[PDB]
Every structure is written in structure tokens, then in C-alpha cells.
Amino acid sequence: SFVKDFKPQALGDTNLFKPIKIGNNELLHRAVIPPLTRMRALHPGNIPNRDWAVEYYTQRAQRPGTMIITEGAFISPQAGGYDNAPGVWSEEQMVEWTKIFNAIHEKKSFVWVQLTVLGWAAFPDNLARDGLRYDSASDNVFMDAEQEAKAKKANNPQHSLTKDEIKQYIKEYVQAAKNSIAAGADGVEIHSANGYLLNQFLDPHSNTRTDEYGGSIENRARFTLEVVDALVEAIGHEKVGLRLSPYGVFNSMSGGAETGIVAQYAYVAGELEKRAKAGKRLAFVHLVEPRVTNPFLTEGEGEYEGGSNDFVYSIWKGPVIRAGNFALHPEVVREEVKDKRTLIGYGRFFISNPDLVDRLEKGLPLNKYDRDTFYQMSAHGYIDYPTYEEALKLGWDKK
Amino acid sequence: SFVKDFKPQALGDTNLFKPIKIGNNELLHRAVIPPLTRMRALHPGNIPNRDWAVEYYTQRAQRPGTMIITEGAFISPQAGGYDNAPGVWSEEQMVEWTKIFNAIHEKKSFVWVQLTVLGWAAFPDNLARDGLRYDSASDNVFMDAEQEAKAKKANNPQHSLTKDEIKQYIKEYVQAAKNSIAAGADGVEIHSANGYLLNQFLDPHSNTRTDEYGGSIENRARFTLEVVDALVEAIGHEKVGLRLSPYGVFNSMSGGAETGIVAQYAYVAGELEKRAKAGKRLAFVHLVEPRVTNPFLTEGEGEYEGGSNDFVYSIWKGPVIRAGNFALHPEVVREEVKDKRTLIGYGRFFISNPDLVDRLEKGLPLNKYDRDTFYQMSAHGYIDYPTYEEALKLGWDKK
Numbered sequence A, B: 001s002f003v004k005d006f007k008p009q010a011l012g013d014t015n016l017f018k019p020i021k022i023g024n025n026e027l028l029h030r031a032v033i034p035p036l037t038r039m040r041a042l043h044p045g046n047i048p049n050r051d052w053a054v055e056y057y058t059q060r061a062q063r064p065g066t067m068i069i070t071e072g073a074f075i076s077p078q079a080g081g082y083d084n085a086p087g088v089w090s091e092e093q094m095v096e097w098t099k100i101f102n103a104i105h106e107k108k109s110f111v112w113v114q115l116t117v118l119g120w121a122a123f124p125d126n127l128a129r130d131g132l133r134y135d136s137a138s139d140n141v142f143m144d145a146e147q148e149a150k151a152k153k154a155n156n157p158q159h160s161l162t163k164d165e166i167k168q169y170i171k172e173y174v175q176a177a178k179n180s181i182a183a184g185a186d187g188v189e190i191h192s193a194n195g196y197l198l199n200q201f202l203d204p205h206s207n208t209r210t211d212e213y214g215g216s217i218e219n220r221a222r223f224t225l226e227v228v229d230a231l232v233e234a235i236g237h238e239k240v241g242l243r244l245s246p247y248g249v250f251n252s253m254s255g256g257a258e259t260g261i262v263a264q265y266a267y268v269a270g271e272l273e274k275r276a277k278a279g280k281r282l283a284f285v286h287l288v289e290p291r292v293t294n295p296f297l298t299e300g301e302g303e304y305e306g307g308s309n310d311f312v313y314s315i316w317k318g319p320v321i322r323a324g325n326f327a328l329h330p331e332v333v334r335e336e337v338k339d340k341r342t343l344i345g346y347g348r349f350f351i352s353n354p355d356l357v358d359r360l361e362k363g364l365p366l367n368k369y370d371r372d373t374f375y376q377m378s379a380h381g382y383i384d385y386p387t388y389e390e391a392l393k394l395g396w397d398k399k
Ligand SMILES: Cc1cc2nc3c(=O)[nH]c(=O)nc-3n(C[C@H](O)[C@H](O)[C@H](O)COP(=O)(O)O)c2cc1C
Pocket: A034, A035, A036, A037, A038, A071, A072, A114, A191, A193, A194, A243, A288, A292, A295, A296, A323, A324, A325, A326, A327, A345, A346, A347, A348, A349, A374, A375
């Protein structure tokens, strides 16, 4: 069915429908697919879904010149811990990714691989089964009681990374980025948001370290910036973006309750701009808005009203992708895209609307999403959401 | 004469004319007199002007319930270096300040003493004459070539403060704050702006230290925060505010060219909010806007368009006074005061309009200022600017 009560607005007369270049890619509009974990990868080996993933991405590439950021992809076994999320370390994985990238390109769209390392969000028992550590910044603060207890039961207590182990992750980021490019991706996004490992280092709640990787703003940002620099060196700044969620609380990050949180993220933005002014500007910065501090809460819930991401624009002078509850709020998008370097990520409603871009241009009704199938091993709720035309034929204009 | 071409707007229908409490003071409107050095203090001894200063402040206190921040006042001889700016360390000074504070209070207005330490902005030859150091954060970067050369000629080369000397300044801030309160002031403003000593510590251009007072965001903010904490302890948070100029370039500060500048100031704001949440909220934060990066340039010049102070409001949750080119821009003020904790400082046009508040409420013409008498040892251009009524009688509605 269509979302009831939603009053659509045609956005074709806004900058959302003006072309923009991101990295090497000439986008034809500024509606971006943000990274969306869907849990259709198959075990063993974290293999992108051999039956459905090509079709999923093909559908969502249908509007020419769309920027697609993939579901998060693990850079190595140790970086993972969800059996049904994909990786980008093995030949068997890359065979499937190559097909996905080719399909997106055939639709004249673009694809950026999000590179993910889970840290404390991983399942410690899966990791133990596979002979892997349960990692985070620290060893004395935990995501929640259940995770702490699972780790202990698995004889895999949370482990504070050594400097050598941080270096090993950086090597894996580099190789994962190389693999992604070699398989045909247009670029990569470094996931430093939503309470995963890099965010666990950024945040003073999760990072109680007293070495050079914690205990100050500069130290907490060190790992994220080392990954940025390693990937810029390996594949070029024009092929690298960075995702941040300053006000997020998902996965036990601090959000605005931490009075130093804006300074922490302002520091990262400033270091990005310093690199840019020295000739190595990242393709984009991708921000999760305080509009959505936890993406598993219904739109409108978990809104933090005490902060704005606007500060980033005073610092970083390149493209900025904003995501969080924009599909149901074209009136907000209309204002935000007046800034000529702003793009808008649409997550949950891209799950349910393969032709979302047409719907945004033309002010059409939106298909309701089905949260129960966000994570499910099924084509249902993955590749069977209709286009607007197909929905009309099903009679959704009445139902 | 009146400013030609200026199209006034009545602001009586805005929050500029709603009461607000700042510290212990019930203000009746939100037009604030920011600190304005006028150079009428007499030598020797940096004595507030015995002939004219009471009248100057009385005139500008005339609208009941006005918050006045004094001209900067030196906390000690070593903090000074301008012979015609006043101090607040001696009995002879406080005799004159007492008269000024009494006069402001008789007009049912309020007075906050700005506490000033010049650092590298001081004149090294005056300091040498008086047996005093020429101080800054560092000893290997200078305000400009002329200052460096003056210091060398005076056998008084710029000196990087020791930790003990920083402690001595803090003692002097404490005593100056006590003196101000005992003499009748409503509070004090810590000057950490416009490239004076505390700002020289905040800014990475001027602060090349490698001890705990430089080399990182936290270290560069340490001196400013130590002064905040010492004054909060001595006289109470409700009697203390702090002035900052994030984007200023006056006195060779970095401004927006420094990519880390927003993070530096965001850190200070966050530390202020942390203290506030722990029960010790400063009376206000006073920001110089990027609208005026150098207050000796004509309105509209030296405007930095690449940054906003809005970030501070995501962090600090108390009153904020904004200053910089607002008199000629009632349309901007109208928008800014929609925020219910925003006050507006009017500097140069309070020099020339003793009845500025009435003029703002009622949308009246503004007297042109005379920059040549901003700093001058004279009543002329100090206490002889007319009220609107007096200007009409002089025929300025025609001239
Ligand atoms: C099912 C689901 C999976 C998600 N997976 C990821 C992910 O892999 N990486 C990431 O950075 N964000 C992920 N997110 C967050 C989204 O990218 C997005 O920031 C968030 O859903 C807010 O945007 P929206 O309101 O348009 O959905 C996910 C969100 C959902 C609902």
C-alpha cells in the first residue's frame, strides 16, 4: 500500500534535480541511496546473495545517474560478526559484487562500496565460533549487558585493540578498497558512523583509552583519519568518502548528551578540509542527521532537537550528503537543497520504492515499507516492492 | 549628522524588546553595549577619566534596564600597555569606577566590567618604561613586524609565559573581579577575544607551545578555562561571562583560514556547557560575529562569509550575546532575535547614539559616528553626541 496521509510534493523544480559531480561520477540528480544492510548474504563466507542481489540493485539503479552506496561490506572476517551481511575480502564475494556493479552501470548509475568494521556491535558468539576476537576501542565499557554477557559465555571477552591490531585493520581497509575498485566500483565510503568500530574510537563513552588513540579529541579521531589517509593513498581521494553521525545514539554512542560531541566532529571535518586544501579533497562527507538518532525507530521518533549538522558546512567545503527522515518531509528537503553542494540520502523509502527518484521528481505517493522484512532471508520485501506503475495496476491508488 | 541612506526599522515588535535575566540582572530589553575601548583614561596610573567617564556611561545607561559591558579594563600593570585605557587593580582606579557604577545604577541599568590582558597587542616600549615584560603564549611568532621590532629596540623581546606567570595572571584576574564586584559592578566579562592574551593561547597561529598550554585543542583552551573556573569560584558563575571571536583576524588571529578553528571554539563552548550541567552556568557567552572580523574596518568590510557562529547554539544552552554590524542591519537582527536566548551587542553606533535603544525600538535615524574620535583624549566625540531630540533641534533631519 501507499503511505496514508502523506502529502507528496514534486521536487523537480529544486536542486535535487540538478546534476552534480561526486568523485569521478556525473550524477544526474542528488537523491542518493545511503548504505542499507539487508541481511541477504549467505553463510558460509558472507557471500552477496547469488539469487537476488543483482536484481535488488538493478531495480534501485533504474533512474539514470543515481549514486548508490552499497549495504555495509565487511573488510575481513575479523571485521564482521553478522553471518548474513556481505564481505569484500574473498574471490567468491567479489565474483558476486562484480555482477552487481556491472548491473548498476548498465542502468547508467554509480556504486560506492561502504566498508564496515563492527567492533562491539558484532555478535561475540559468531566470532568465537570462527576463532575471531570481539573487538572495540576499550575493554571496560560495553555496548549493552547482553553483548557483554554473550562475550563472556563465548569465552571471548571484549578486547581493546593493540596498535598492531589497529594497523592490521588498516591493511584490511586498504585491501578491501582495492578489491572494490578492481571489481568495478566507483569508490568506497569509510563507515565511521552508527556506533561501529571507528565510531567507537571517536566517542568518549566507548573510548576510555590512554594511549595515542584515546583521551583527547585528536587521539579519538586518529584511527578514522589513518583509514582516510591510507585509502586516499591507495585508491585516490576522488574515490573515497566518509560517513559520520555526530548526534547518533544507535549502538550506544553518546549523541548530544556529550557536550564535547560537536567539537569531536568539527575536528574531523577540519582535518578533512586541511587535506582538501593541500590537494586531496575527499569525494564527499556523508552525515546522518539528528532527525534520526537511531534508524530502527519509526520516522519522527528519536529526533534530537538540540543540535544541527550545519556546523560541518562552516568547516568542510566539499559535497555533503545528508540522510534521515527526508522522504516524508519534502518541505525540509526543499530548503536543504538550496545549498548547492547538498545531496539527500533516502534510506527506508528506497527499500520500499525502487523508483523513488521518479516519485520525488513528480510528487507521487510512496509505497509503505515493511520493517519486518528489512532483515530477512527473502526476495519478499527485497525485490517485490512495485514501481508506481505496478502499484497502480495492483489498485493501490484505492486501497 | 544622521547616517545617509540608512532605512531604519522599528524593532519594538521583536524579542529585542522582551525582558530577559542575565546573571543577577533583570534586563528590560536585549540591546547590549559591548565593551568599547575609548582611551580617555589618564596617565599615570590608568585612571578612568575623572572629568567625563561618569557622563559617558550615564548617557548610555539612559534607557532603563540596559546591560552595559565596560571598556576593557586591565587587571594589573603587567596586563596593560596602553597608557589611556583604564585598570581595575588600584584604589585610585576603583574610586572612579565606583562613581561610574553608581551612575549607571541610578539610571536603572546594569554594568559588567570587561577584564583585559593584552599579551602581544601591548606596546613593548610602554611596558619596558614601567619595568614590565612583553608577554604572549610563544616567543617565536609575533603580532607584526613593527611590534617585534619595537620590543627589540626596547630591550624587551616577546616572552613566552611560564606556568608560574600564567598562575600570577590568574591571581590578578581573581583580584580584579573581586575589586569590580566590591566597587558595585553586577559582574565581569572575561575577554578571550580580539587577539588579546587569552585569544593568543586559543589560536594555533600564536600558540606554538609544547607544554600543557599548547599543542592541542584542550591545551590551547586551558588558560581560558582556568580563568573561567577561578572567577566562578571567587565571585560566582552568575557574575561571570566570557567573550570569544571565533572568526576574528584582528591582532593577527587565524580566523576561518584555520580549518581547526571551529573545533577549537566548539571545545570551549562544550566545556562551558559541561560546567553548566554540573551546576555552574556562566551568565552568558558573548560572540563577535564573522560579520566583523576586524572592528577597525568600516561596516561591510572584513566580512567572513565562510562561517557562522550558529554552531555555538548546538552546544552552549545559555544566553548568547552577538555583536558585529547589527545597527545598520535591523533586518538581520529581526531574524536573529527570534531565538529567545539571543541578545544583540551594538558597538560603534552606541558610541554615536546615547539613546540608541529608543532609536531601535522606534525605527529612528542613527547618528553617524566619527571614527577619528573613537580613541582621543576629548569630551568631543565622547559625550557630545546628541540624542534624537537634540539632533532634531540641531536640524539634522535636514542636513
Ligand atoms: C534496515 C536498515 C539498514 C541500514 N544499514 C546501514 C548500513 O549498513 N550502514 C550505514 O551507514 N547505515 C545503515 N543504515 C542507516 C541508513 O543509511 C540511514 O542513515 C537511516 O536509515 C536514516 O535515513 P532514512 O530515514 O532515509 O531511512 C541502515 C538503516 C536501516 C533502516
